[PDB]
From a paper:
Outer surface protein C (OspC) plays a pivotal role in mediating tick-to-host transmission and infectivity of the Lyme disease spirochete, Borreliella burgdorferi. OspC is a helical-rich homodimer that interacts with tick salivary proteins, as well as components of the mammalian immune system. OspC consists of four long α-helices, two shorter α-helices (4 and 5), and two short antiparallel β-strands located between α1 and α2 (23, 24). The biologically functional molecule is a dimer (with monomers referred to here as OspC-OspC′) that assumes a knob-shaped structure anchored via an N-terminal lipidated moiety in the spirochete’s outer membrane.
To elucidate the structural basis for B5 IgG’s specificity for OspCA, we solved the crystal structures of recombinant OspCB and OspCK at 1.5-Å and 1.9-Å resolution, respectively, in the P21 space group. OspCB and OspCK each formed homodimers nearly identical to those of OspCA (unbound or bound to B5). Specifically, OspCB and OspCK monomers each consisted of four long α-helices, two shorter α-helices (4 and 5), and a two-stranded β-sheet. The monomeric form of OspCA (with or without B5 Fab bound) was structurally more similar to OspCK than OspCB, with an RMSD of ~0.7 Å for all atoms. By ELISA, B5 IgG reacted with OspCA but had no detectable reactivity with either OspCB or OspCK. Superpositioning the B5-OspCA complex onto OspCB and OspCK revealed additional structural attributes that likely account for B5’s inability to recognize OspCB and OspCK. In OspCB and OspCK, Glu-175 is superposed with OspCA Gly-174. The bulkier and negatively charged Glu-175 side would be expected to clash (sterically and electrostatically) with Trp-100, thereby impeding B5 interaction. In the case of OspCK, divergent primary amino acid sequences at consequential residues further contributed to a lack of B5 recognition. For example, OspCA Lys161 forms a π-cation interaction with B5 Trp-100, which cannot occur in the case of OspCK due to an Ile residue at this position.
Author numbering:
A (entry chain B): 42 to 116, 118 to 196
B (entry chain A): 42 to 115, 118 to 197
The structure:
Amino acid sequence: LTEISKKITESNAVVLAVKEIETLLASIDELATKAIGKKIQQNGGLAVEAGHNGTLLAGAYTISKLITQKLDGLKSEKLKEKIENAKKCSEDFTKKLEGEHAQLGIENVTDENAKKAILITDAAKDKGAAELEKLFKAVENLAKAAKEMLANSV
Amino acid sequence: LTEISKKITESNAVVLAVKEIETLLASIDELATKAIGKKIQQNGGLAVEAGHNGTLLAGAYTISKLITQKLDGLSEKLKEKIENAKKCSEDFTKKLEGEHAQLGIENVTDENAKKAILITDAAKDKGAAELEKLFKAVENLAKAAKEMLANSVK
C-alpha cells in the first residue's frame, strides 16, 4: 500500500506534465481560430484588421519552441515511444515555420498565409499547419496513454 | 478504504483543471517576453521587427477570455480563491479593452504592448499590472489545490 501512493503521485506527475503540453497546443489553436487578422475593439471583442499577422506567428513559433522543451523534460519505459514521436512532430512543426520565412517571417503576413501555418482546419495547410495537425495527434495519443496509466494505478 | 480513491481522482481533476489555467497564463508570458516586436527568422529564431503588435495583443486578449471561461468551469473549499482569480481575470480583460486607443490598432508599439502583457515592464499601466495580479491569484489557487491533493494521497 506504500507503493501505491508512490505510484499514484509519480504517474499523476506525468499526467500534469502532459496537460501542460496539451494546453500549450490549445493556446496556438486559439490564436489561429480567433486572433488571425484581428485587433482589440472598443467596448470589447475583436475587430477585423487583415494582413499583419507577423508578430502573432512569432508567438506561435515561440510556443512551439516551449512545447519541445516540455517534451524534453518527460522521462518512463512505457511511454518512451509515444514521447519520442511527439518530440519529432514538435521539431518538424518548428522547422516548417522556419522554412516558410519568406512568407511567414515578415510583418505583413496575410491572413491566408497565417492560416496555412497554424490553422489545422485550413484547406491547404501547407505552411506548417499539417505538421501542427500531426503534433496534435501525437500529443493526444500521449495524453491518452498517460491517463490510462493513472487509472491503472488508482 | 476503496472510497478514498474517489477522493484522489476528484481532487486530481481540480489540479489538472488549474494547471490548464496556469499554462494559459504561461503562454501569455511567453508571447510577452519573446514575441513582441519580433518575426520568424531565416535559419531559425526570431529577428527584430518593431511595432505591429496589434494581432499579437488580440491573441493575448483571446487567451485572457479563455482563462475566464476555464475559471468558470471550476469544490466548496476553494470558492474564495476561485472567485478572486475570476475577478482578476475579468479585470485584466476589461483593462485591455479600455486601452483600445493604443492597443486596438495594427501598429501597436513595442512599448505599449509591453505595458499591456509584460509583467516585468516598469510602467505596466495598460494591463500588465492586472495580469500580474491574475498570476498571483492563480498561483495561490494552484498551491491550495495541490495541498488538497496531497492530503488525499496520504
